[PDB]
Amino acid sequence: IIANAVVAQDGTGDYQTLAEAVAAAPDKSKTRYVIYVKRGTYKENVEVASNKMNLMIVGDGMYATTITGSLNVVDGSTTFRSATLAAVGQGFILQDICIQNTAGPAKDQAVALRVGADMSVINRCRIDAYQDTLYAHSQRQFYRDSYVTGTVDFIFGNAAVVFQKCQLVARKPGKYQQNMVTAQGRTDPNQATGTSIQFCNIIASSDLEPVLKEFPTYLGRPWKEYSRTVVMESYLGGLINPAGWAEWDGDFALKTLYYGEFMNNGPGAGTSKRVKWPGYHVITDPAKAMPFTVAKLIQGGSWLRSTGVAYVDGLYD
């Protein structure tokens, strides 16, 4: 397959900026339309609206093509509108590209990527910020072979979302901060949403590794009352606090959240000193892990197979 539109800074493409290519893309396309973004750093805030369906934005590699911005809550943006790139168009695919927000930890919430696009795939991407890096807002999403890095609540929202074979990398935050890989925001138990992390690497960056004892990292904290997160068949580095999970605000959500761990490995995977919250579960029964697979949580096959991306449908690698 060849690209339908090319973005490049050296004049060799169809457009100089990503925003222009997205605007010129067809509305309600019944087939995949591909925008290729050549190597370079593109300082823009891009939006892929609901009418821009089945759009694939693909770069020259996750180290080579970068979309960057620095909107943030401290400077007066909402979290929702702080995203460097935001996509809600059904069937969105993002690949071989970096989305970053360079605001830094002192600017509080500053989103790199926001996704509210159903049946979306993020493949071989690098998503880079600090607090609130990845706003997996809503709808069904699949992240594969990607790098997501941040500090406080760096994967947050209320998508039905599976991360598979991603490296989730906690980095050195600001003074006195505590890292949280997830802040899952399911408000209502009738919602079939949640975050599932499977066959992933949850590790420390080189700047966090020397100072693990100063800056703790937890798997998650319950942003909302029915927070629902499971980490399974994954490697957990020593950065992961023995307690595993952190309070949001005292005893808020501790009985109604559902946080699970199933068959993890690595120096941070031991569960004997985990929180004793009623809502926390060491899962040993595979039938209790199954709801968090691609097949059950995001109905993935019905739409993943036509993307070409690799996925594991069930529990085991």
Binding site: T79, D118, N158, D188, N190
Partner: protein, 151 residues
């Protein structure tokens, strides 16, 4: 007899009183099966979202403070997405895709919640909008409950 299905739906929602009021507003309530109650409930939720979109536009049109306007614009974008998602929810219910119905009703619900989350600290949310968010949430919850009861 009251539609027995109402006794399975309303108690599972976060606002049973509102659920009852909404379902009883159907003159033909007793003739409706779960799918019928579902379509009615999506229609109610979408109409509320549409009205609130206009409320937000009106609040914006009298605002000059950039931070407040940014909060309203976020609310506006979220309601636009919620309206779109509820529109698609109807087709999913018709097709019997109850998994997609739940996901899209969940997304719509979260449009109102994202508006709510955007008003943390000053400038504070207008009471009118706070109530309209909670209403969309309550209405979308009727849809979510029905989506889980369907086979």
């Amino acid at each position: 007899f009251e539609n027995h299905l109402i006794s399975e739906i309303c108690p599972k929602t976060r606002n049973p009183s509102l659920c009852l009021q909404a379902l009883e507003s159907d003159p033909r309530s007793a003739s409706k099966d779960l799918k019928g109650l579902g379509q009615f409930s999506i229609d109610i939720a979408q109409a509320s979202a549409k009205q609130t979109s206009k409320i937000i536009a009106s609040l914006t049109n009298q605002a000059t403070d950039p931070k407040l306007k940014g909060r309203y614009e976020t609310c506006s974008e979220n309601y636009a997405d919620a309206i779109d998602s509820l529109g698609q929810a109807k087709q999913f219910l018709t097709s019997g895709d109850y998994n997609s119905l739940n996901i899209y009703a969940s997304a719509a619900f979260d449009g109102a919640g994202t508006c709510e989350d955007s008003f943390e600290g000053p400038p504070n949310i207008p009471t009118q909008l706070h109530q309209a968010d909670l209403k969309l949430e309550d209405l979308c919850d009727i849809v979510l409950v029905i989506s889980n009861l369907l086979p």
